[PDB]
Amino acid sequence: SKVSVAPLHLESAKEPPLNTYKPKEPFTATIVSVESLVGPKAPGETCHIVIDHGGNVPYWEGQSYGVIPPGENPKKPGAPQNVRLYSIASTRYGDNFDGRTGSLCVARAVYYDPETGKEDPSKNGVCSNFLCNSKPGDKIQLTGPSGKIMLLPEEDPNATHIMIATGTGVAPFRGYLRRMFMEDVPNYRFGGLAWLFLGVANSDSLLYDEEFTSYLKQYPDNFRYDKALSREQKNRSGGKMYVQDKIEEYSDEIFKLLDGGAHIYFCGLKGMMPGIQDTLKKVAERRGESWDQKLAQLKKNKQWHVEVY
Numbered sequence: 001s002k003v004s005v006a007p008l009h010l011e012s013a014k015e016p017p018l019n020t021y022k023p024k025e026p027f028t029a030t031i032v033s034v035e036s037l038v039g040p041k042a043p044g045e046t047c048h049i050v051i052d053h054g055g056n057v058p059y060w061e062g063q064s065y066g067v068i069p070p071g072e073n074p075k076k077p078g079a080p081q082n083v084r085l086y087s088i089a090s091t092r093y094g095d096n097f098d099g100r101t102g103s104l105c106v107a108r109a110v111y112y113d114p115e116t117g118k119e120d121p122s123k124n125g126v127c128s129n130f131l132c133n134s135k136p137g138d139k140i141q142l143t144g145p146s147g148k149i150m151l152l153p154e155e156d157p158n159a160t161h162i163m164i165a166t167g168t169g170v171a172p173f174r175g176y177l178r179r180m181f182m183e184d185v186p187n188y189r190f191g192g193l194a195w196l197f198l199g200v201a202n203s204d205s206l207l208y209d210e211e212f213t214s215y216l217k218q219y220p221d222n223f224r225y226d227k228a229l230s231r232e233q234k235n236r237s238g239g240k241m242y243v244q245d246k247i248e249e250y251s252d253e254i255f256k257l258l259d260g261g262a263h264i265y266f267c268g269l270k271g272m273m274p275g276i277q278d279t280l281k282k283v284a285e286r287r288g289e290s291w292d293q294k295l296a297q298l299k300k301n302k303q304w305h306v307e308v309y
């Protein structure tokens with residue numbers, strides 16, 4: 001059974017909120033919870049951060065929140081820190097199904113000297129550590145929401161959505177999939193195919209795995225889920241197993257879906273994209289197709305959605 005959500009008036013707007021709060025006057029939100037998403041063998045920490053915005057900073061799935069960490073801009077004395085953007089990992093109703101909270105999926109950026117391995121905290125990422133170090137009741141300066149690239153196309157409730165994530169790039173897809181499958185949204189009844197491909201370092205680095213596995217058992221004809229574990233698996237050519245290698249295992253199914261009008265999404269660190277492009281080119285070549293021409297048509301048809309960072 002789908003989970004009741006409120007308030008239904010969040011469905012009424014016909015345009016997404018944008019820049020409701022700006023950097024000079026952010027919204028002072030409050031941390032609800034911070035929890036690690038990863039096991040002890042993960043190379044670094046990734047946390048789920050729940051933020052109470054009280055309904056003052058609503059958003060649509062696929063958008064980002066800005067966070068202004070405290071302190072001074074190290075490059076402009078007297079000025080605030082620059083905004084850092086984070087893909088919202090929750091639906092518009094949020095993890096408490098009430099329209100009052102939104103969630104972030106935040107990897108700690110930690111610096112290690114390339115030769116000695118010595119950590120240097122002064123070179124760690126300011127906003128990501130600020131967020132992962134936060135505790136219930138702490139205040140967060142929120143801006144936005146912002147972004148339109150990753151809004152979910154809902155005009156066809158039976159569309160196909162192929163979602164390609166590495167690491168924290170899973171965030172918008174957690175939101176899409178909760179709206180598609182878990183929440184009782186009477187004006188969006190999804191009857192298409194949602195297919196999540198996720199690449200992470202190892203099993204302990206998986207994010208939200210139990211939630212996604214649950215969708216396989218509840219919606220076996222509408223959801224597919226495939227994972228690539230780069231430090232624990234090898235591809236067919238002998239390289240470390242990346243998300244593009246999982247795509248290749250389903251070369252024919254995914255190309256057929258794209259030809260049929262499927263939307264395809266990419267999110268996570270930008271270093272994910274070169275290997276993906278290389279694989280898609282090789283898959284097309286084996287089929288006797290030009291990947292350049294196919295990608296041009298996907299962009300012209302508004303099927304191609306990329307937000308990497």
Ligand SMILES: Cc1cc2nc3c(=O)[nH]c(=O)nc-3n(C[C@H](O)[C@H](O)[C@H](O)COP(=O)(O)OP(=O)(O)OC[C@H]3O[C@@H](n4cnc5c(N)ncnc54)[C@H](O)[C@@H]3O)c2cc1C
Binds near residue numbers: 107109110122124171
């Ligand atoms: C649209 C969008 C969505 C995003 N979504 C997410 C998301 O869902 N989750 C997420 O985790 N991130 C996400 N990001 C990235 C996020 O915005 C930040 O860039 C990231 O968290 C790092 O910010 P920071 O403040 O921690 O690091 P910063 O302080 O900005 O530092 C940047 C990097 O430089 C390194 N560094 C600092 N000083 C030195 C030095 N002297 N020498 C060498 N290295 C140094 C830091 O360790 C860090 O890796 C997103 C970005 C965009 C644009």
